[PDB]
From a paper:
Tumour necrosis factor (TNF) is an important therapeutic target for treating a range of autoimmune and inflammatory disorders. To facilitate further characterisation of these small molecule compounds in a variety of contexts, we here generate a monoclonal antibody, known as CA1974, that selectively binds with high affinity to the TNF trimer–small molecule complex.
Structures of TNF in association with small-molecule indicate that the normally symmetric trimer becomes distorted, resulting in a breakdown in trimerous symmetry. A prominent feature of this perturbation is the generation of an expanded cleft at the altered interface between two of the monomer subunits (subunits A and C). Overall the homology was very high, with an RMSD = 0.43 Å with no significant variation in the degree of distortion at the A/C receptor binding interface. Variation was seen in loops containing Tyr87 but this is perhaps not unexpected, given that the loops are flexible and poorly ordered in the compound-only structure. Whereas in the structure with Fab and receptors the loops are stabilised through protein contacts with either receptors or Fab. This suggests that the CA1974 antibody recognises the true small molecule-stabilised form of the TNF trimer and does not induce significant further structural rearrangements as a result of binding.
Numbering used by the authors:
A (entry chain B): 7 to 105, 111 to 157
B (entry chain A): 6 to 106, 112 to 157
C (entry chain C): 9 to 19, 22 to 31, 34 to 85, 89 to 101, 111 to 157
Write the structure that this text describes.
């Protein structure tokens, strides 16, 4: 008997230039048991405890400057409050000393949260141009009802 | 649907308590469920088994100082049968390669899967709370999830 | 509990070999040929962590990769990431995890490209697991 757990696993569009865009209509990606993908946000169908997780992989060609900053943030908007709050957020200086060999920064973010029916979750970054799409499974965003 | 019964916790750094690292579950988007407690800044495991522990602290500094900086983040475990701190996980980072002749950001991620015992006390501590960053929620958290 | 479930850990020499002997392996999941075999079509949470270590930075530029693959009941990346670590020692884990609709009889691999940089001190940080939803 299949699970009725609301779940989703969405992957980033490699040819969406200038943006981090989630897709479900791709191999090994899904929306099930009521989770919707609307306006690039995962929409929660029922209240409960959820795992929420996201991966982005950044790459640079050497370190031209010590100043490049990288950000990756999961956000929540609850229907009652109509406000947008970070659940999980990382900021990273990839370059300590100026350089030209390629560098990589994977950021995985996850945890368990109390969510409400109709919440909208978003997973966002500051620099889509630094995203790497060399192989599949490098940029994803999901939730799993516990 | 039947709400899960697995013990889980996600506590966040108190953003009001600068100069300190104080964990809260009484804060937006933080929680304890199914017997996990937060007591004396420590997570307390209600039942035996494998748990995921996960955690992030975010550090930030303005340029680089004279005295070389090391940042440490450590997760340790006090057992009822052995009530002194045993480190389970630790990580360090030198945020600074040379003294500045510009902000830097250094997240430390730290987590793993461990056999825990009922009544285990879990602490997540850092050496440099003056470099810790709470400017926004979601940067500093500490959680466990029973397998 | 009846739900398929597995938590295996690494051992061995120059390889990433998964063992079922702080580990689990129940309810129809099998560890065959270093891959996990799915006993029934359904939704699964799949996860892993590997930890790399080294001392100082060599003159050849090392890339660390770690990947979980689906082997149909062809081989496809489900989860994958890359780190660039560069005579002081250094430590670098890689995290993977997500939910996936799987078919009965699929296999799952979790592999690294440089077993020579693998660690075996923190048993808590080298593992590979699944749980049926
Ligand atoms: O500490 C930090 C800071 C930043 C990242 N990080 C960290 C530390 C360790 C591992 C890790 O990722 C690998 C990992 N090991 C697991 C071991 C066990 C489980 C698990 C969860 C539920 C369950 O019922 N059984 C098993 C999940 C694991 N994951 C992925 C993961 C981590 C956190 C939240 C959710 C999630 O899964 C996602 F939904 F798919 C990440």
């Amino acid at each position: 008997t299949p699970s009725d757990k609301p779940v989703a696993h969405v992957v980033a569009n490699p040819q969406a230039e200038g943006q981090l865009q989630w897709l479900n209509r791709r191999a090994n990606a899904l929306l099930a048991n009521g989770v919707e993908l609307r306006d690039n946000q995962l929409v929660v169908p029922s209240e409960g405890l959820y795992l929420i997780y996201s991966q982005v992989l950044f790459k640079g060609q050497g370190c031209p400057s010590t100043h490049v900053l990288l950000t990756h943030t999961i956000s929540r908007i609850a229907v009652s409050y109509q406000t947008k709050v970070n659940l999980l957020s990382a900021i990273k200086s990839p370059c300590q000393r100026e350089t030209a060999k390629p560098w990589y920064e994977p950021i995985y973010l996850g945890g368990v949260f109390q969510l409400e029916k109709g919440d909208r979750l978003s997973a966002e970054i500051n620099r889509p141009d630094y995203l790497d799409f060399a192989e599949s499974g490098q940029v994803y965003f999901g939730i799993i009802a516990l």
